[PDB]
Structure formats: structure tokens, C-alpha cells
Amino acid sequence: TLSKEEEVLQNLQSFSAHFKQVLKNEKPLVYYGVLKAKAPNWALWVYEKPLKKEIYMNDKEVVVYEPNLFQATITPLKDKTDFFTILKQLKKQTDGSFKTTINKTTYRLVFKDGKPFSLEFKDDMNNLVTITFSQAEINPKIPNEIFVFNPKDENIDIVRQ
Structure with missing residues (x-):
């Protein structure tokens, strides 16, 4: 009664992948990075190119770290919307997507x-975001510390918005 893709989601406890992130508008400026996600609701998006940014996410908040600025912006989250939460919630559609x-x-x-393979949604400006995964790993061992936002030094301005 479970399709092979449905079993992956039921059994999933962690995930890592390289990603390409495209936002559709004037000219596609494409971001590249690495995703790591892990139960219960942890996610880390490391952008490597062309800008370096680290986005830590859990159930309660998101932290956007901009190393070129020495600044981290923290946003409380009202809805659980991290990557692992979303996957554990997906339901199969008639077209075979989730x-x-x-x-x-x-x-x-x-x-x-x-x-x-890919994740698609509209952002809060109604712009279509497409994230495509490569070198995807199902249930890799991901150490917990990778998910701890450790500045590490303390030049960092902490911005709340």
C-alpha cells in the first residue's frame, strides 16, 4: 500500500544533497550549495556560490548568517516549515508529484x-522558487554539531527582524 517514494518519506530520518536554487524572474541568477536535514526538524542550507550564506533552521526559528557582512539575522517562525518537516508531510498527488x-x-x-529530485514553491512575493538536488543521500549520518550555529568569533552583529 506504500509506493517506493512513499516508503522513502515514511522511513526518512536525514537527508543531504547538493542543490541548485533558481528564482524565476528577469534573468535567472542561480545559487548553488549543500543541504543537510535531519529529524526532528533540523535543516542547514550552505550557499557556496556566488554568495556565501548559511541558513540554520529548526521548528522555532531561522538564522541567516552572512559571513561577508559578519552579521546574522534571526527570525522566529510561526509555522513549522523546515525541509524535513515538509517532506514528512507530503502526500502523493494524481500526477505522481508530492x-x-x-x-x-x-x-x-x-x-x-x-x-x-526537486522542490518548488512560491515565495512571499509570489515568485517561483525551484530547488534541484544532486548527489542526494538518503539517511546519511550527519553529526549534530553541524547544525549548531557557532559564530564562531564575536564580531557578529545579531539582527532581529
Whole structure:
């Protein structure tokens, strides 16, 4: 009664992948990085190119660290919308994609060769965000400390918005 993709989501406890992030508008400026996610609701997005940014996320908040600025911006989250939460919520659609809606934003996951392949949603400006995964790993061992925002030094301005 579970498809192969449905079993992956049921059994999933961690995930890592390289990603390409495209936002559709004037000219596609494409961001590249690495994603690590882990139960219960932890996620880390490391952008490597062309800008370096680290986005730590859990159930309660998101931390956006901009090393070029020596600044971290913290936003409390009212809805659980981290990557692992979304996956554990997806339901299979008639077209074979997977979807879920959280706070009026619909997220669409497509699989390929048995692994998460792409994630698509509108941002809060109604712009379409497409994230494509490569070198995807199902249930890798990801050490917990990777997820701890450790400045590490203390030049960092902490901005709350």
C-alpha cells in the first residue's frame, strides 16, 4: 500500500544533497550549495556560490548568517516549515508529484530514481522558487554539531527582524 517514494518519506530520518536554487524572474541568477536535514526538524542550507550564506533552521526559528557582512539575522517562525518537516508531510498527488500546504504556501516535491529530485514553491512575493538536488543521500549520518550555529568569533552583529 506504500509506493517506493512513499516508503522513502515514511522511513526518512536525514537527508543531504547538493542543490541548485533558481528564482524565476528577469534573468535567472542561480545559487548553488549543500543541504543537510535531519529529524526532528533540523535543516542547514550552505550557499557556496556566488554568495556565501548559511541558513540554520529548526521548528522555532531561522538564522541567516552572512559571513561577508559578519552579521546574522534571526527570525522566529510561526509555522513549522523546515525541509524535513515538509517532506514528512507530503502526500502523493494524481500526477505522481508530492504536495503539502503550510501557511498558504504549497510545496511540490518530485522524485527521480527513488530520491528527492526537486522542490518548488512560491515565495512571499509570489515568485517561483525551484530547488534541484544532486548527489542526494538518503539517511546519511550527519553529526549534530553541524547544525549548531557557532559564530564562531564575536564580531557578529545579531539582527532581529
